[PDB]
Design a protein around this ligand. Structure first.
Ligand SMILES: Nc1nc2c(ncn2[C@@H]2O[C@H](COP(=O)(O)OP(=O)(O)O)[C@@H](O)[C@H]2O)c(=O)[nH]1
Ligand code: ALF
Ligand SMILES: [Mg+2]
Length: 317
């Protein structure tokens, strides 16, 4: 028997990562040939990241700690080109490593909410020595951490618990939402993704709009849509891992002014949950299956997705 799952959510919420986990958890994961295709994407992400932080250093006016880096920066752009073609010279590695360790670069890094930087920036930059070895091969984790904008409709297939799953993943930026209506026919369940750690960020598409707020508006829309009435609405409060660290230093009031709880994971998490479920207009007839997740964490996605299958099975079957 078949089952159609449609992954939805604003930009960079984690939809695609959940899709990669399906291959890792139900298929043997990514082969060598496949992990090598992602080698270029890992090198691209690393350069984009370090360059992106360097750019911000100019707009926020942040000097390198050791002017010595001024030349590493200049060399960064000279050698950068290779990374994009899937190669990482030993020289490039050193330049990126030195800039990354610079106090100036670091101060700008801790202020990333003030601009746009890839969540997986630190993950790679802190593993430069590994991803820079000759004949380097991306690991399951490296592949899960890759960032590639999803534009259009990606369709994935896999078999789990005797069911033949058909998973649909789409883009989430404002410009990509006009395409959502293409995956609406016969949806067994929707897995709506929300980046928990976006409470203090702003849409890349519109500086003035708070990311968490955009997400809420999208949830209110789908969830309350008459059309998806008999469609299991699964809510994934993703990026719980990043949220856990951010809630320690970044005030949740930025997003929810009337939040009188502490800067700890449990109170902050539960609050954001109630906010999203409160958008549900038919609280008695419609039900929302929620799960806190870490899309990059395979163990976590496996048990979470296991729990989701039972519900999908105990229902639409
Ligand atoms: N640390 C961390 N990174 C995540 C998580 N979920 C997604 N990411 C990363 O965030 C970036 C964007 O996510 P992606 O899966 O492309 O989401 P989509 O664009 O909304 O489908 C990717 O580089 C992911 O690896 C999570 O729970 N924790
Ligand atoms: F960044 Al997404 F699907 F919203 F690519
Ligand atoms: Mg996507």
């Amino acid at each position: 028997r078949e089952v159609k799952l449609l992954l939805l959510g604003a930009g960079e919420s984690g939809k695609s990562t959940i899709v990669k986990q399906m291959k890792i958890i139900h298929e043997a994961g990514y082969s060598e040939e496949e992990c090598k295709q992602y080698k270029a994407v890992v090198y691209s992400n690393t350069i984009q990241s370090i360059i992106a932080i360097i750019r911000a250093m100019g707009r926020l006016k942040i000097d390198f700690g050791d002017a010595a880096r001024a030349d590493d920066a200049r060399q960064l752009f000279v050698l950068a080109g290779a990374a994009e073609e899937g190669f990482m010279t030993a020289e490039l590695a050193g330049v990126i490593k030195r800039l990354w360790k610079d106090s100036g670069v670091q101060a700008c890094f801790n202020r990333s909410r003030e601009y746009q930087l890839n969540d997986s920036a630190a993950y790679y930059l802190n593993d430069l020595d590994r991803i820079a070895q000759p004949n380097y091969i991306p690991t399951q984790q490296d592949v899960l951490r890759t960032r590639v904008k999803t534009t259009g409709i990606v369709e994935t297939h896999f078999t789990f618990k005797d069911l033949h799953f058909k998973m649909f993943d789409v883009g989430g930026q404002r410009s990509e939402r006009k395409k959502w209506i293409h995956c609406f026919e016969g949806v067994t369940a929707i897995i709506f993704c929300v980046a928990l750690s976006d409470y203090d960020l702003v849409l890349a598409e519109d500086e003035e709009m708070n990311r968490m707020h955009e997400s809420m508006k999208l949830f209110d829309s789908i969830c309350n849509n008459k059309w998806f009435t008999d469609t299991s609405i699964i809510l994934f409060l993703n990026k719980k891992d990043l949220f856990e660290e951010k809630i320690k230093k970044s005030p949740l009031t930025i997003c929810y002014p009337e939040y009188a709880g502490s800067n700890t994971y449990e109170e902050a998490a539960a609050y954001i949950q109630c906010q999203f479920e409160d958008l549900n207009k038919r609280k008695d007839t419609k039900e929302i299956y929620t799960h806190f997740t870490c899309a990059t964490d395979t163990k976590n996605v496996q048990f979470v997705f296991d729990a989701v299958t039972d519900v999908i099975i105990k229902n639409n079957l």
